Amino acid sequence: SIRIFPRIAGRSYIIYGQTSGIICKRMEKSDNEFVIYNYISEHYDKFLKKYVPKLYGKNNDMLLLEDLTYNYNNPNVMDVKIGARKRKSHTSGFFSIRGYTNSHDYKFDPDEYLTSESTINHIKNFMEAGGENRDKTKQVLLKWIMKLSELANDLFEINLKFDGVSLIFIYDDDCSKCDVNVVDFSRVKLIDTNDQMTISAVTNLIKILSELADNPL
Ligand SMILES: O=P(O)(O)O[C@@H]1[C@@H](OP(=O)(O)O)[C@@H](OP(=O)(O)O)[C@@H](O)[C@H](OP(=O)(O)O)[C@H]1OP(=O)(O)O
Ligand SMILES: Nc1ncnc2c1ncn2[C@@H]1O[C@H](COP(=O)(O)OP(=O)(O)O)[C@@H](O)[C@H]1O
Ligand SMILES: [Mg+2]
Numbered sequence: 001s002i003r004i005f006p007r008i009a010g011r012s013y014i015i016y017g018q019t020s021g022i023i024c025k026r027m028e029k030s031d032n033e034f035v036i037y038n039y040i041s042e043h044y045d046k047f048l049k050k051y052v053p054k055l056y057g058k059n060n061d062m063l064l065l066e067d068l069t070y071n072y073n074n075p076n077v078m079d080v081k082i083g084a085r086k087r088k089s090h091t092s093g094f095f096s097i098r099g100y101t102n103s104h105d106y107k108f109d110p111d112e113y114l115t116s117e118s119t120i121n122h123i124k125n126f127m128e129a130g131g132e133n134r135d136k137t138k139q140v141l142l143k144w145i146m147k148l149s150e151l152a153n154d155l156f157e158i159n160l161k162f163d164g165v166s167l168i169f170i171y172d173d174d175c176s177k178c179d180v181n182v183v184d185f186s187r188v189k190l191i192d193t194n195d196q197m198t199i200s201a202v203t204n205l206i207k208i209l210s211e212l213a214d215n216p217l
Pocket of ligand 2: 006007008009010011012013014023053065066067068069077079166168183184185186
């Protein structure tokens with residue numbers, strides 16, 4: 001019995017693993033994603049441990065990846081592309097929200113270019129599922145800011161172009177647990193400097209989330 005994994009975005013074949021806590025992702029165009037996990041493992045092991053789901057193995061053209069939603073009763077997931085898009089410019093300036101849990105209920109369209117005001121409204125839409133205890137939703141926002149802060153810092157010292165990578169924001173309905181990790185290395189490339197487009201995406205999100213944690217309404 002093959003069980004299809006409930007993606008929030010993208011074109012890739014992702015099924016639940018035969019086993020608890022794993023998803024399998026088909027590398028469709030090349031094994032570049034595998035080359036890149038293994039390169040980050042050699043040269044930036046600390047970055048891998050803190051910010052990337054664990055790669056457990058490869059089976060032909062499938063990566064056996066840590067399921068980021070596994071320890072969640074009621075996960076809310078949001079995919080934000082922070083790396084360069086292939087051709088298009090970003091739908092929210094420095095980044096592109098690709099989807100989120102219940103996005104359909106707020107007539108979210110991934111092809112729509114958004115104002116600052118609309119971008120913030122879509123992130124606020126993503127947080128509705130967390131209920132109205134604004135104390136525990138601030139805690140979710142702050143714990144995301146804590147890890148994005150460190151990621152923006154660490155990214156200055158990493159000589160990769162993160163073309164096409166996303167942040168996966170997760171929080172539980174009861175707001176008791178949350179996390180953000182970096183995924184989708186299939187178009188990442190080696191370069192001789194750091195990636196300022198990707199750092200500006202993260203710093204922008206940190207700005208947006210800070211505004212929400214401080215906003216007193
Ligand atoms: O966002 P870019 O421009 O890079 O390409 C995107 C592409 O978007 P498009 O070429 O703008 O239509 C997406 O197609 P849909 O939006 O699902 O129709 C695709 O599904 C990957 O989007 P996701 O990363 O959201 O899947 C891909 O990205 P990649 O993995 O870099 O080939
Ligand atoms: N390790 C993971 N744990 C949980 N969900 C994941 C994981 N990796 C990817 N996903 C889900 O799959 C979607 C797309 O994955 P991604 O790596 O961006 O692949 P693609 O190359 O198809 O865009 C994300 O929006 C997310 O919901
Ligand atoms: Mg992707």
